[PDB]
Design a protein around this ligand. Structure first.
Ligand code: ADP
Ligand code: ADP
Ligand code: ADP
Lengths: 474, 712, 110
């Protein structure tokens, strides 16, 4: 590990590092694992010390010596792939790397199941619900939750049975089961160690989750699946498949579900890049992070690389006013360069979105980039009903609920606003259900009450702005 | 049954404890009855029981003096056994403890013990240790003989004797002048946060030794010097009993290579040997400075050694490491990685209430004159921290000392207790010290609960209810976590943000144009993250971003340079808002006078979803505004506030305030001239009306009304 | 909302405890009248000290809920200083505070 080697005096750090390699050869086959690689071998151009520059040279030569040390593989771990001296990643040496990232909802459940192999769980314990609530948690945190829940069950029962000793009867241990209250307690005590980092995962959104936009759902399948399902027709007719599509229109119409739904059917990772990340890169003079984003897609393939809020760069330059020039800037130029160098054979498809298409650098719409445009208006009469029905698939609905009447009233509402109505009506039905035990379905009164609080998120002037733009494009 | 958990006292008196009334009813004892408390090691103490509205049903509130006599600590359990058989004493022999009687002489009974017991009817048991404060010294005594045994009640007719040498303290007894929880004034919330994290593994180590999950390994306390970072660390160790090891940057950095790292790791080994223990590392930025700022081997290697020592804490069971810095971003970021020092607490600067509490703590031993008003002092000492209030009390004492000692002229090794007993510190001595004292924390932003309440705002009755509902709804029943205010200037936008914070007892964080501009001008917009982090640490709080478009206007506003509506700072604000949950107890309020040129992203779902227009006050509101502005002054009955409001049809609230202040100034001038009239007369308001003008034109109102109708 | 009545006890110099029942709004003059009727000498001036260190004045029309003596309190009994000086100077031990009429019915505390 980095910090232990660095805690040594000059000459001791180099000798200790060499010994590990010499011992590995004597004990070959062997694996040498270097933790905190950025601490043992930080970028030389980022430090001042001679010892730090020397230990990097020592590690570089020891890595090269692996052509002679038969059957020895060196592995290393860092927090950021670009926080280490780039020499280590040159041909040979550390010529392979794997992005571990953060477990997704399925992996988090798997981790909870792994760390409960020996635990007796009560019938009320639901680890899937926990895995969905533990956003930002990593295996270290999920393991803590399992052990803490075990301790709570042990202290409630076993600590009133057993002595303060190291030996317990097998029957007493087997009689101890962990309830859901003990897991919930541990969840309130634990705090996610990785809540700010972006998590990339295969989404669970399917086509059945999207109300309306039937032609867009099919269009995405043509853009994403056809180039690899029927490649002989694309070659036969000399067609160049598009590398991506840009969506524009009012917010809250399902743009996030469109990209996730195609990623779901294709079993591909969904990478969500938000405006604040593009803004950070420009303001923080860290445009190299654009390569990190596109490289994540190349390593996460198959994946869908979704760039939200494409207008954030144009807005950073003033957006509505700004200077007298265009939208071109350092970050967008780096993004466009990476797009041009990406091949469709890496199973990466790029999707963009914006709520202000009038200020997007036209370069992004040139052939080879997001040349295709799809307009996503507010849902129409049949789509708004479909959205309400989709959200209610998970709960009984009373026969007195008139979803078409509600959809006719919510003429200016987006899909996001219809969802709030359904979710609020669900909460109201739950409130009544809970009180009845101190109900089996959502009643018309719950939807009519929800209508008193729900409002449209898109104003009438915004609707006209979006419709006029779409009309201008013919 | 008949057993309670030991908690902190509210009444500092050494002869009384407080129970929740239902437990006094179960024990069938009345307020003032004398009871025995049974502690550990077959020890007992006698005290009087009262009750209050704050003690928990299952806890007993007792101060440090009572806990020390029982040899118990906070979190322990004792039994309560009423002892109505206690009678009055005839003779009690009390002698001082040597540790506190040094440099002082004279008749200690007349100065300390006599007024302490006189008509107090305190229960006394043989062997009791108690503190009597006075004469700028804290002197504690032990009871060595009681004619009745083993305890009695002192009476005015009880003989109090005191002859003999001072008593040496036992090794199991701690001095009452050692820092504890009762020595900490403001920042009570931060202290409670440390208690939750630290006291459990130290008082109940068995809970964490049985499991593979470790408690937090290090806590970083940051804020200005003199705010209590080290005081908390020591007080917690002293109250729980954990061994306290003191480390600081300069002590390690002054050593040569090898000796430095050796001393650092040696202290960690000692902490394990003396576990449970707390290791406090002061000046963390000095022991672990950022590596990119130095080329020395000693500085880099010490950081490496500290990084490994923190990791080794998973083996050094029951050892907790704490550190102090000025800012969380002034230290080597490696220490803040998962584990190590991944938990931090913002101590901040005490507010007027905290400053008063700190002064009251420092004056515990001081004899104050009746003219001394510590609350007024706390109100004037803006920007001061506890270290400065300690200096203030010292300087006020020294001025009083000089005034009397110049006349006393007692030149010896010790000072008589009698001459100290007659020494009092007056308001003139605090006033002098205030003129000589200079705050050490005047540059940092001071965040506290504002004094503006709803009664200070005229008109806008519906906006008041809206803000109360926005905060009350998520507590009584995705709720919005912010609102934008737009409209003419001088209508109360800022007052609304303060008034809701006032009623909620929430901290108010004020960001003004000049601060937003400073971050833009200096390309230091990253400081926005610190502002949002402060809002979290200050929770509950209201985070008010005034003049949102101040940068857009500075860049041209209506003309424009290289930018437009968005800038470095507003983009950082948008970024940080996405990371704040509705459960953080922070309400973000914005204000602008030009909502048409502000980056509309701020109103997008999840951010400032509420949007409220603040128009000019109407006639009934303008009268309410005049009445609010005049609520602090005498006003003659001839003043017709409705007549004034009828004329000032186009005036803003700020313009009505100018009228009030004009009339006030005139009334004062007339009074001064007459002495060389006692209330504001209509003539003063009529003169003000000749110069006061509306600051908001009709065209500006149309601009706001059109915007309101555009967005609905 | 818990209380509207109070029970008072008085600690007497002779080692006896005197108890009685009062309204939470009762005035201090009714407690002094109660004690006077219980004392062996109802005319002999005395003072009652409250559990918080505040002396209760017979001539002050304050309520028990205003003096901090509700729902219950113990008072400390002492004779006026004027009569204590004459009692002590004469060599008279004040070994009886209450009238034999009440003492003949004394109960033990449990
Ligand atoms: N067409 C739709 N069908 C079903 N749900 C929708 C639709 N549009 C939006 N929603 C709901 O609204 C929420 C927000 O959608 P999203 O596309 O993230 O909006 P935004 O424009 O803010 O990204 C989603 O979680 C989804 O549940
Ligand atoms: N919050 C506080 N409450 C009470 N006293 C305080 C507080 N903050 C500082 N002080 C006082 O100021 C001094 C702080 O000096 P020191 O012991 O070096 O601690 P630090 O510099 O870490 O604040 C002490 O005399 C302490 O009593
Ligand atoms: N609604 C109001 N009621 C009472 N006084 C007001 C009102 N609006 C403005 N004022 C007066 O104007 C002054 C400035 O108010 P403030 O809220 O700071 O304005 P802004 O928010 O535009 O900076 C206050 O001192 C207050 O006396």
């Amino acid at each position: 590990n980095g910090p232990e080697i660095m805690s040594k005096l000059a000459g001791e750090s180099e000798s200790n590092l060499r010994k590990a390699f010499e011992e590995a050869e004597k004990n070959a086959p062997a694996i040498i694992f270097i933790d905190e690689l950025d601490a043992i071998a930080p970028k030389r151009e980022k430090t001042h010390g001679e010892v730090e520059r020397r230990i990097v040279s020592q590690l570089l030569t020891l890595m090269d010596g692996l052509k002679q040390r038969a059957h020895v593989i060196v592995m290393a771990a860092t927090n950021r792939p670009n926080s280490i001296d780039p020499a280590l990643r040159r041909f040979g040496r550390f010529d392979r790397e794997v992005d571990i990232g953060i477990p997704d909802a399925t992996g988090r459940l798997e981790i909870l199941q792994i760390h409960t192999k020996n635990m007796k769980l009560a019938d009320d314990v639901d680890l899937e619900q926990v895995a969905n609530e533990t956003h930002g948690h990593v295996g270290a945190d999920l393991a803590a939750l399992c052990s803490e829940a075990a301790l709570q069950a042990i202290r409630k029962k076993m600590d009133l049975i057993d002595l303060e000793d190291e030996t317990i009867d097998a029957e007493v241990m087997n009689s101890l089961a962990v309830t859901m209250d003990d897991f919930r307690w541990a969840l309130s005590q634990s705090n996610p160690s990785a809540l700010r980092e972006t998590v990339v995962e295969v989404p669970q959104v399917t086509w059945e989750d999207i109300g309306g936009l039937e032609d867009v759902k099919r269009e995405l399948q043509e853009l994403v699946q056809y180039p690899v399902e029927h490649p002989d027709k694309f070659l036969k007719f000399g067609m160049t498949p598009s590398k991506g599509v840009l969506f524009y229109g009012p917010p809250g119409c399902g743009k996030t579900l469109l990209a996730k739904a195609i990623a779901n059917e294709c079993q591909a990772n969904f990478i969500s890049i938000k405006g604040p990340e593009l803004l950070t890169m420009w303001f923080g003079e860290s445009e190299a992070n654009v390569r990190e984003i596109f490289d994540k897609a190349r390593q996460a393939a198959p994946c869908v690389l979704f760039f939200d809020e494409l207008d954030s760069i144009a807005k950073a330059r003033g957006g509505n006013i700004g200077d007298g020039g265009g939208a071109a800037d350092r970050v967008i130029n780096q993004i466009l360069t990476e797009m041009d160098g990406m091949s469709t054979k890496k199973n990466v498809f790029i999707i963009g979105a914006t709520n202000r298409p009038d200020i997007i650098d036209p370069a992004i719409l040139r052939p080879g980039r997001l040349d295709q445009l799809i307009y996503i208006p507010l849902p129409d009469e049949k789509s708004r009903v479909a959205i309400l029905k989709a959200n209610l698939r998970k709960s009984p609905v009373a026969k007195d609920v008139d979803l078409e009447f509600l959809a006719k009233m919510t003429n200016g509402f987006s899909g996001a606003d219809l969802t709030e109505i359904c979710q609020r009506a669900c909460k109201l039905a739950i409130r009544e259900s809970i009180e009845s035990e101190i109900v089996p379905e959502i009643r018309r009164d719950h939807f009519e009450e929800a209508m008193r609080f729900a409002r449209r998120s898109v104003s009438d002037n915004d609707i006209r702005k979006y419709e006029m733009f779409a009309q201008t494009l013919q | 049954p008949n057993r309670l958990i030991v908690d902190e006292a509210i009444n500092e008196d050494n002869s009384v404890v407080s129970l929740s009334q239902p437990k006094m009813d179960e024990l069938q004892l009345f307020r003032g009855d004398t009871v025995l408390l049974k502690g550990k090691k077959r020890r007992e103490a006698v005290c009087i029981v009262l009750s209050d509205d704050t003690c928990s049903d299952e806890k007993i509130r007792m101060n440090r003096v009572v806990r020390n006599n029982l040899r118990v600590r906070l979190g322990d359990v004792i039994s309560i056994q009423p002892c109505p058989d206690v009678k009055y004493g005839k003779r009690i022999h009390v002698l001082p403890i040597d540790d506190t009687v040094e440099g002082i002489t004279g008749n200690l009974f007349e100065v300390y013990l006599k007024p302490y017991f006189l008509e107090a009817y305190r229960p006394i048991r043989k062997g009791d240790i108690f503190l009597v404060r006075g004469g700028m010294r804290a002197v504690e005594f032990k009871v060595v003989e009681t004619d009745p045994s083993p305890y009695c009640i002192v009476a005015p007719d009880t003989v109090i004797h005191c002859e003999g040498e001072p008593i040496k303290r036992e090794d199991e007894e701690e001095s009452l002048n050692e820092v504890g929880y009762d020595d900490i004034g403001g920042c009570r919330k931060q202290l409670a946060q440390i208690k939750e994290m630290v006291e459990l593994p130290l008082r109940h180590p068995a809970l964490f030794k049985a499991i593979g999950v470790k408690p937090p390994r290090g806590i970083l306390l940051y804020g200005p010097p003199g705010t209590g970072k080290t005081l908390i660390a020591r007080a917690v160790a002293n109250e729980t009993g954990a061994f306290f090891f003191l480390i600081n940057g300069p002590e390690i950095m002054s050593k040569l290579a090898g000796e430095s790292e050796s001393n650092l790791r040696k202290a960690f080994e000692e902490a394990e040997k003396n576990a449970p223990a707390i290791i406090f590392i002061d000046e963390l930025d000095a022991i672990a400075p950022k590596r990119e700022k130095t080329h020395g081997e000693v500085e880099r290697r010490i950081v490496s050694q500290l990084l490994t020592l923190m990791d080794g804490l998973k083996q050094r069971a029951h050892v907790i490491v704490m550190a102090a810095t000025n800012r969380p971003n002034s230290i080597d970021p490696a220490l803040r990685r998962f584990g190590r020092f991944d938990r931090e607490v913002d101590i901040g600067i005490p507010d007027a209430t905290g400053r008063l509490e700190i002064l009251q703590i420092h004056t515990k031993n001081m004899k104050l004159a009746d003219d001394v008003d510590l609350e007024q002092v706390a109100n004037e000492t803006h920007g001061h921290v506890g270290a400065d209030l300690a200096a203030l009390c010292s300087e006020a004492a020294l001025q009083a000392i000089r005034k009397k000692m110049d006349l006393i002229d007692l030149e010896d090794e010790t000072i008589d207790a009698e001459v100290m007993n007659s020494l009092a510190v007056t308001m003139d001595d605090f006033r002098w010290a205030l003129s000589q004292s200079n705050p050490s924390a005047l540059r940092e932003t001071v965040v506290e609960v504002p004094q503006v309440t709803w009664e200070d705002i005229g008109g806008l009755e519906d906006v008041k209810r809206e803000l109360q509902e926005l905060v009350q709804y998520p507590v009584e029943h995705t709720p919005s976590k912010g609102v934008l205010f737009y409209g003419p200037p001088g209508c109360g936008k800022t007052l609304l943000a303060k008034a809701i914070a006032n009623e909620c007892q929430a901290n108010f964080i004020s960001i003004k144009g000049p601060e937003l501009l400073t971050m833009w001008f200096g390309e230091s917009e990253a400081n926005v993250r610190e502002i949002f982090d402060k809002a979290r640490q200050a929770a509950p709080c209201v985070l008010f971003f005034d003049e949102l478009d101040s940068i857009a206007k500075a860049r041209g506003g209506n003309i424009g340079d290289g930018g437009g509506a968005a800038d470095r700072v507003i983009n950082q604000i948008l970024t940080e808002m996405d990371g704040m949950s509705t459960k953080k107890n922070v309400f973000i309020i914005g204000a602008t006078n030009r909502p048409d040129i502000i980056d509309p992203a701020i109103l997008r779902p999840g951010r400032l979803d509420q949007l409220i227009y603040i128009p000019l006050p109407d006639e009934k509101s303008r009268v309410a505004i005049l009445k609010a502005n005049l609520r602090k002054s005498p006003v003659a009955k001839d003043v017709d506030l409705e007549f004034l409001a009828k004329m000032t049809n186009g005036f803003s609230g700020a313009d009505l305030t100018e009228i009030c202040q004009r009339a006030c100034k005139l009334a004062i001038r007339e009074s001064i001239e007459s002495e060389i009239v006692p209330e504001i007369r209509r003539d003063h308001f009529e003169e003000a009306m000749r110069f006061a003008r509306r600051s908001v034109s009709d065209n500006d109102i149309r601009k706001y009304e059109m915007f309101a109708q555009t967005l609905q | 909302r818990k209380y509207n009545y109070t029970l008072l006890r008085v600690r007497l110099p002779d080692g006896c405890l005197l108890q009685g029942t009062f309204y939470a709004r009762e005035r201090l003059g009714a407690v002094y009248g109660f004690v006077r009727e219980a004392l062996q000498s109802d005319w002999l001036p005395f003072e009652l000290l409250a559990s918080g260190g505040q002396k209760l004045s017979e001539d002050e029309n304050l309520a028990l809920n205003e003096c901090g003596l509700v729902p219950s309190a113990l008072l400390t009994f002492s004779w006026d200083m004027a009569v204590l000086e004459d009692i002590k100077a004469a060599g008279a031990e004040p070994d009886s505070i209450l009238k034999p009429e009440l003492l003949s019915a004394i109960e033990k505390l449990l």
